[PDB]
Design a binder for this molecule. Structure first.
Ligand code: HEM
Ligand code: HEM
Ligand SMILES: N=C(Nc1cccc(OC[C@@H](O)c2cccc(NC(=N)c3cccs3)c2)c1)c1cccs1
Ligand SMILES: N=C(Nc1cccc(OC[C@@H](O)c2cccc(NC(=N)c3cccs3)c2)c1)c1cccs1
Ligand SMILES: [Cl-]
Ligand SMILES: [Cl-]
Lengths: 362, 362
């Protein structure tokens, strides 16, 4: 029935994978084992090599990702053995610790057991493992609006935030068979944060801005050879503009441009003054300066685009078709100063890859 | 034969056009006249109203244009009567004069006779009526590289540029039946230019930058109800970023960022300093400041995006589907500070509209 779809993706993956691993001879027999394993059990289990390489391929095929040059150095933690919520929690804690690596961030993914019957084994509620809570009631707007609904979900379960602008959300997830998720407060020793200061403008610290060191996306599905790993959090390091041009800048996020304009001492009254643009540049300089000063890995959008240019060259000379989403590849500031802006990209979806899936809350 | 295609577009245009003009009753009879006129002559001639409204509709349907709020105030000059190159020249001169309007730019289009048998009556060689020449030989790079090939074509015909960085290209066009185009030097009294100065940084004038006041696109085809007006130059006013973030900024255009960085007194050594971004903002502030100070119409990208938001609202409440090209609608600086970035657009092509056509040179 539906089993047919699994087998097809399995054939396509193993061939491409073993070909890249120089194990092309091993394919016929590996596929055979898979064929009967699917027949008898409905599914099939990846080898360490298949899983590691598949997660790497998936990153390589992520059209919206400018950081793909480094796809082959992805650190893959295999946690398909977890059976308990204490094990899941500790796996998540460990991922944070090893990925952070005292500021010298290692791109890492932790892979939990895949969906069985489409039925999840572990269901992560966090959008990122480290994220700030958001509150909204009676005109009062506190923290990160992006987190408003998860925050309300957490507070249903007996969590309570301090209602600071930077409350760390607890880890929150649900195990198969449990009707309700559990939540665990993040140990503050695990979480690096960076205060935002400006290299030249000493008053920038009056804004009392900060951001977390490591963005760990925990709400996407890794799909590898027909196998659906809904729980598979991954991280890289930030590109500065993600923090300075979006998280802290967007009107629906922290909305700090008017405040930035004030501390940098420019008026925020006239569009033709380009005060938003000027505020953006200083905020973004501030962010890069602050991460580098603390010794936390970060990349600027120009360096990132140069790296991506190498990914493009690398893919061509390896005989691989390149795929990309121009609308996400261009940085939100000075995009025409990067080569990305001035070319176009095939937005075709190639598997393995990371996909969106529906939130369990709201 | 091919006549069928004309008739279809004709039916579609007249219906939509007269409907918008509140002349829906007049359609059946207008179409009838057209039907027999096509039968007897192979083509059909637009009324003043049809032509004017069609050029307006075409602008309204230009997916890449952020300035569309003002589509209905387009000033349409009907020059389908030209038969001579002195008439074409004078029509082009007049367009420049009336559109410039002493700096208070009127959006204007001059419409020349359409293609007959696919055969052009007037063939304009300029990409814009006012543009700077570009030269390239023996490492030496002078003027605007975008104009390198047209410039070489002009110099074939006995034109010679001064080889300044801002030589005005002559008007150059070809009449049906002539094997060769003619060129006419632009009278300098017709052409407003703006020296680029900075409001705060007095040394900015050392760059000796300038740009022309009015961008007059003269190489696109206006298509209205099956009729192909290949020669139909049009203008608006600039959005500042077109000059400051592209014409003067691009490495393949004037490439001035390093020089800007120098006069504004910041180092241009480290990506993480965001010196390109900072140079961009100051150059773009300089451009808006300079146009406004001279009294030449210009719009900043924030004001432009606000206007386009009104176009969006206006289209919806008029019951018209909106179409757009997100990749051209976002400004090349601070695009995430505009609403455009945060929504998406249907890039469908609706006629009437402006289309690319092949250059006659190179
Ligand atoms: C090593 C440093 C990395 C950098 C600097 C980087 C940079 C980025 C940036 C800027 C985005 C766009 C996000 C946005 O603008 O909203 C992005 C998207 C993405 N990146 Fe990366 N990335 C890195 C590593 C990774 C890793 C390790 C993975 C997974 C293994 C990954 C997978 C993705 C995916 C799936 C998206 C798209 C998410 C979506 O569609 O919403 N990246 N990356
Ligand atoms: C009134 C002031 C106007 C402003 C500020 C404006 C602004 C712009 C801008 C910024 C672009 C993109 C060009 C680029 O980034 O390379 C554009 C494209 C365009 N505009 Fe407008 N525009 C205006 C008036 C007009 C008029 C009067 C017409 C024709 C009647 C027009 C038709 C177009 C077309 C056809 C394009 C796309 C050209 C292409 O595909 O290469 N616009 N406009
Ligand atoms: N950036 C856009 N969308 C958007 C809007 C709001 C939030 C958002 O978060 C991405 C966030 O979830 C995310 C996803 C994937 C990677 C990152 N950033 C990172 N450095 C990494 C996290 C984990 C590995 S790399 C961040 C993306 C648009 C571009 C064009 C039109 S809209
Ligand atoms: N801007 C882009 N392409 C591009 C690259 C080089 C030159 C160029 O010139 C447009 C130039 O011919 C042009 C065309 C139409 C309008 C304008 N600008 C104006 N204000 C007007 C001229 C006439 C009426 S409005 C200018 C456009 C891209 C966006 C995203 C990916 S590439
Ligand atoms: Cl983020
Ligand atoms: Cl231009």
């Amino acid at each position: 029935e539906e089993k047919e779809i699994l087998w097809n993706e399995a054939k396509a993956f193993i061939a491409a994978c073993y070909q890249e691993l120089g194990k092309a001879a091993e394919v016929k027999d590996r596929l055979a084992d898979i064929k009967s394993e699917i027949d008898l059990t409905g599914s099939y289990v990846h080898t360490k090599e298949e899983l590691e390489h598949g997660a790497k391929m998936a990153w390589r095929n992520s059209n919206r990702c400018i950081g793909r040059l480094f796809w082959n150095s992805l650190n893959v933690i295999d946690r398909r053995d977890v059976r308990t919520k204490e094990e899941v929690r500790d796996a998540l804690f460990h991922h944070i610790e090893t990925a952070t690596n005292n500021g010298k961030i290692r791109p890492t993914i932790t892979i939990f057991p895949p969906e069985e019957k489409g039925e999840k084994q572990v269901e992560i509620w966090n959008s990122q493992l480290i994220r700030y809570a958001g509150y909204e009631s009676d005109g009062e707007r506190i923290g990160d609006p992006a987190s408003c609904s998860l925050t309300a979900a957490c507070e249903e379960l007996g969590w309570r935030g301090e209602r600071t602008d930077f409350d760390l959300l607890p880890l929150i997830f649900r195990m198969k068979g449990d009707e309700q998720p559990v939540w665990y407060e993040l140990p503050r020793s695990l979480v690096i944060e960076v205060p935002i200061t400006h290299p030249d403008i000493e008053a920038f610290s009056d804004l009392e801005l900060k951001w977390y060191g490591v963005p760990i996306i925990s709400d996407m599905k890794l799909e590898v050879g027909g196998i659906h790993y809904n729980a598979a959090p991954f991280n890289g390091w930030y590109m500065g503009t993600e923090i300075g041009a979006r998280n802290l800048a967007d009107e629906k996020r922290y909305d700090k441009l008017k405040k930035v304009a004030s501390v940098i001492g420019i008026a925020a009254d006239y569009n033709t003054d380009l005060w938003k643009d000027q505020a953006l540049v200083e905020l973004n300089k501030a962010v890069l300066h602050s991460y580098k000063k603390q010794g936390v890995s970060i990349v600027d959008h120009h360096t990132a685009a140069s790296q991506f240019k190498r990914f493009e060259e690398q893919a061509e000379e390896a005989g691989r078709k390149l795929t990309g989403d121009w609308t996400w590849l261009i940085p939100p500031i000075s995009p025409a100063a990067t080569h990305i802006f001035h070319r176009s990209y095939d937005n075709s979806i190639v598997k393995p890859n990371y996909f969106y899936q529906d939130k369990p809350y709201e």
